[PDB]
Design a protein around this ligand. Structure first.
Ligand SMILES: CC1(C)[C@H](/C=C/C=C2C[C@@H](O)C[C@H](O)C2)CC[C@]1(C)CCC#CC(O)(C(F)(F)F)C(F)(F)F
Ligand SMILES: CC1(C)[C@H](/C=C/C=C2C[C@@H](O)C[C@H](O)C2)CC[C@]1(C)CCC#CC(O)(C(F)(F)F)C(F)(F)F
Ligand SMILES: [Mg+2]
Ligand SMILES: [Mg+2]
Lengths: 11, 240, 240, 11
């Protein structure tokens, strides 16, 4: 799912 | 005999600025990690060091010209596969040929091979690692070349999980250009440097592979995986 | 007028010993948690405090007479649903009516309501919490009664996910006996204590429920859940 | 799955 990664790659 | 183009140069300003924004030579944030201890005694501290670094590698990546325009999936795919390599490359900044270790303070934040062993890793990894760190340090890379090598490593299209492996191949080539050009123009005495640098990328794959295997083993033991952090678990996990 | 039976007494020796084995009045292990800081600034430290406590609550549970013979699933089900309650009960040991806070050192390991707020919780929880802590402290429970209340809270058959809710109901009753008997025999002036104690269990459910809702919200925000620990995520997660 | 919990509840 990579919830954290998606969130950090978000700006 | 030449001189970088405006575009290439703006790229260098971006990578260098990006690195400054995501790398502190004071290592002051380490006091917030679970304190080190020297079974897998260093695991908590190092898990936090690595986790923090991934957060920093992501920040850098987001500032690599072109990366933000990829599909979240490819960004993830690239981050996931290269993460560990980017961390090894940037760690060079703290590596000391003197005592063959990463000195981010000390004696508390000085990391020797023994320490990494107390985190669940073996000499099968640490041996080539320090060797890589040494050889890399000897190259005395200009900050500009150091930041390029990192941006280049991240955009390696040859990563499991990558989709649009053609747009990635392109961007990595654009960067490989700026690096080659830069060494030819700004690097006195650097004629075989480029070759030496691309070779480092190859050595990274072996270190990555080794780390992945050693990580997988640690990962399957719940008493150890419970010491890791959610982001580390996510980035290094087998999750599709 | 009476006197506990041999069996009941051996149970008390087990719970008391179990607690001593899983609770340090020196709080020396806190130096290994990510250091506190006063957005959700205390989240890292408190996540580690809670996580450490779950590890301790599990150790205690495994020593509650009868628990080890339940199905891993019911052990899990019981731990998962009561975890937070057990932590609130045992925390009383560190609560100070003086400054209305948990003092496990200080000023570094002294936890005020404000601090818990910097970890993502509101007064909707903290208000009843301190209130509960105060009322509970006033009861001046004998260690024996404190350990029983905990063992009783854990074996509440009324937990979502519980299977054999009949064997659990039995064990909790066996313990409720020893507690009632003990207060009648060893507790001078304790006639309404038992009632006051069972009432505390009811107040725990409200605190639990509130915590669960507040936790769920924090849990869904990846920037915050990434500060939690794998065990906390597992114990408090919605995972079936 | 509760891998960690199962592991800790194990002796
Ligand atoms: C000890 C390491 C962290 C090395 C040290 C690098 C140094 C620095 C300091 C500064 O230059 C800033 C840099 O961002 C990081 C690189 C890889 C390493 C050997 C990696 C050690 C590791 C590991 C893990 O397998 C675990 F923790 F579980 F054991 C993890 F990957 F899951 F985390
Ligand atoms: C601040 C708390 C940890 C309280 C303090 C208790 C004190 C002690 C010291 C000593 O007596 C030994 C005891 O085992 C623990 C109990 C519940 C609390 C309000 C709970 C605070 C919390 C929380 C969380 O929701 C998060 F961290 F995410 F915000 C968590 F549940 F997910 F973790
Ligand atoms: Mg190339
Ligand atoms: Mg009852």
């Amino acid at each position: 799912r990579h919830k954290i990664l998606h969130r950090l790659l978000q700006e | 005999s030449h001189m970088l183009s405006d575009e290439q140069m703006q790229i260098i300003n971006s990578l260098v600025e990006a690195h400054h924004k995501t790398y502190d030579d004071s290592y002051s944030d380490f006091v917030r990690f679970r304190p080190p201890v020297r079974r897998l005694s260093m695991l908590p501290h190092l898990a936090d060091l690595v986790s923090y670094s991934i957060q920093k590698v992501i920040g850098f990546a987001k500032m690599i010209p072109g990366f933000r325009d990829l599909t979240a999936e490819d960004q993830i795919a690239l981050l996931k596969s290269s993460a560990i390599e980017i961390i090894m490359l940037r760690s060079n900044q703290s590596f000391s040929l003197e005592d063959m270790s990463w000195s981010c303070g000390g004696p508390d934040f000085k990391y020797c091979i023994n320490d990494v062993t107390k985190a669940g890793h073996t000499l099968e990894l640490l041996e080539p690692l320090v060797k890589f760190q040494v050889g890399l340090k000897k190259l005395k890379l200009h900050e500009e070349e150091h930041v390029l090598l990192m941006a280049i490593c991240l955009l390696s299209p040859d990563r499991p999980g990558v989709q649009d492996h053609v747009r990635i191949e392109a961007l990595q080539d654009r960067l490989c250009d700026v690096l080659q050009a830069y060494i030819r123009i700004q690097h006195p005495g650097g004629r075989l440097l480029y070759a030496k640098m691309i070779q480092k990328l190859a050595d990274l794959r072996s270190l990555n592979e080794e780390h992945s295997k050693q990580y997988r083993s640690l990962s399957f033991q719940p008493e150890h995986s419970m010491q890791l952090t959610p982001l580390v678990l996510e980035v290094f996990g087998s999750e599709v």
